[PDB]
Each structure stands twice: as structure tokens, then as C-alpha cells.
Design an enzyme around this catalytic site. Structure first.
Site, short mmCIF file in Angstrom:
data_model
loop_
_atom_site.label_atom_id
_atom_site.label_comp_id
_atom_site.label_asym_id
_atom_site.label_seq_id
_atom_site.Cartn_x
_atom_site.Cartn_y
_atom_site.Cartn_z
N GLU A 1 35.57 -11.97 27.39
CA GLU A 1 35.74 -11.76 25.76
C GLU A 1 37.12 -11.02 25.61
OE1 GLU A 1 32.09 -13.46 24.35
OE2 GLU A 1 34.11 -12.73 23.65
N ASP B 1 38.11 -15.34 16.34
CA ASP B 1 37.55 -15.71 17.80
C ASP B 1 37.74 -17.11 17.75
OD1 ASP B 1 33.93 -15.75 17.27
OD2 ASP B 1 35.47 -17.07 16.25
N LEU C 1 31.38 -10.08 16.97
CA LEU C 1 31.39 -10.86 16.04
C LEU C 1 30.89 -10.10 14.65
CD1 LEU C 1 31.64 -13.63 14.59
CD2 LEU C 1 29.15 -14.06 14.80
N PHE D 1 25.09 -13.69 24.63
CA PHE D 1 26.22 -12.81 23.92
C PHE D 1 27.00 -13.81 23.28
CE2 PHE D 1 28.42 -8.64 24.16
CZ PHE D 1 29.56 -9.11 23.67
N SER E 1 18.43 -27.90 30.33
CA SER E 1 19.21 -26.95 31.19
C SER E 1 18.28 -25.70 31.69
CB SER E 1 20.41 -26.23 30.67
OG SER E 1 21.24 -27.24 30.49
N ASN F 1 24.30 -30.48 33.85
CA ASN F 1 23.42 -30.54 32.62
C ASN F 1 23.90 -29.57 31.49
OD1 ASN F 1 20.88 -29.92 30.34
ND2 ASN F 1 20.99 -31.91 30.97
#
Ligand SMILES: *SCC1=C(Br)C(C)(C)N(O)C1(C)C
Length: 164
Positions: free
Chosen positions: A11, A20, A32, A104, A117, A132
Site C-alpha cells: 500500500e 488510490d 480509503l 484490506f 477461489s 482461479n
């Protein structure tokens, strides 16, 4: 390596409001603020989050505080989610960090939608799960980060974060 160091790599750290990868106002270590296109709305979210009138800049300690809160929130969101909890519980500590990383970045709902998945991860079919996971908007929009997270799920090691 641990989940904090991992997400700090993925990040970054910026002390002033920035957009972002999706164009949304963010600050700190991937915190965010809002999907609103208004910068003033983002500054109001920031002031509420930090508890003071900031005008768009925070300290490193304040960024790390939001980051601690956000990691905690991702873990508690996993454990509160009926689709994500059983997968989290089934994983080793390195792969658990990979799952926290995805929540996250894209939120509890977003990850819980990866049903196929998640099933391959619960089954510990790691190479199939990796193939996948790459069939996703997520992978296409942030492929280098997604590759690191997927290698983490495939191998159960931190190899993708070494030398980072
Ligand atoms: S996780 C998506 C699903 C699968 Br792979 C099977 C087991 C075929 N299902 O019935 C769904 C759609 C739950």
C-alpha cells in the site's frame, strides 16, 4: 515478514491525501477515505477519522494508527463473515495474511464473492486456487500486487515479498 509489513509494501505510505489505484481519495497506508469525487468530502472523512481539523495532511504516527485500525477491521470482518471465516480458519498463518491482504484492499463483501477461489483454498489445491484467483478484475487492475498475494497463497511462503 508479517501482515503489517506485507500491507506496508503493497500500500505504501503517503501523508497527504492522494488518489488510490481506483481514483479514490486515500491517505496513510492505503486508508480509503471515500469514493466521493469531492476532495472536501474526503477531507471531512479524514478529520472524522483522525479526530482533528487536518486539511489533508497527517503524521506518520496518525497514518500507523489508521493502519492498525484497518488491519484489525479486516480480521474482524473475516471472522464475522460466514463465507470467509471457515476459509481463514483452514489456513496457515502465511496464507491467512494473504486473505487479510485481499480483504484490506477490496473489502469483506468483495472477497467473499470469490466463491470458487475460496473453495479451492479450503481444499488446499494451491496451484488451482492461484490460477482461479487470477481470473478476476482484481488481478487485471493490480496485477503485480495480485501476483504477490497469489504467490503467497500458492506457496505458503513470503518469497514474493523478499527483496521488497
Ligand atoms: S463456489 C461455486 C459453486 C460450486 Br464450485 C458448486 C459446488 C458447483 N456450487 O454449487 C456453487 C455455485 C456453490
Amino acid at each position: 515478514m508479517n501482515i503489517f509489513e506485507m500491507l506496508r509494501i503493497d500500500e505504501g505510505l503517503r501523508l497527504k491525501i492522494y488518489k488510490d489505484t481506483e481514483g479514490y481519495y486515500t491517505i496513510g497506508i492505503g486508508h480509503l477515505l471515500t469514493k466521493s469525487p469531492s476532495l472536501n468530502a474526503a477531507k471531512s472523512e479524514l478529520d472524522k477519522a483522525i479526530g482533528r481539523n487536518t486539511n489533508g495532511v497527517i503524521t506518520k504516527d496518525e497514518a500507523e494508527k489508521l493502519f492498525n485500525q484497518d488491519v484489525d477491521a479486516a480480521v474482524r470482518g473475516i471472522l464475522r463473515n460466514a463465507k470467509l471465516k471457515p476459509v481463514y480458519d483452514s489456513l496457515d498463518a502465511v496464507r491467512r495474511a494473504a486473505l487479510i491482504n485481499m480483504v484490506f484492499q477490496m473489502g469483506e463483501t468483495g472477497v467473499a464473492g470469490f466463491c470458487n477461489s475460496l473453495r479451492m483454498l479450503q481444499q488446499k489445491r494451491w496451484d488451482e486456487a492461484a490460477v482461479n484467483l487470477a481470473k478476476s478484475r482484481w488481478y487485471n487492475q493490480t496485477p503485480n500486487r495480485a501476483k504477490r498475494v497469489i504467490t503467497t497463497f500458492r506457496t505458503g511462503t513470503w518469497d514474493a515479498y523478499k527483496n521488497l
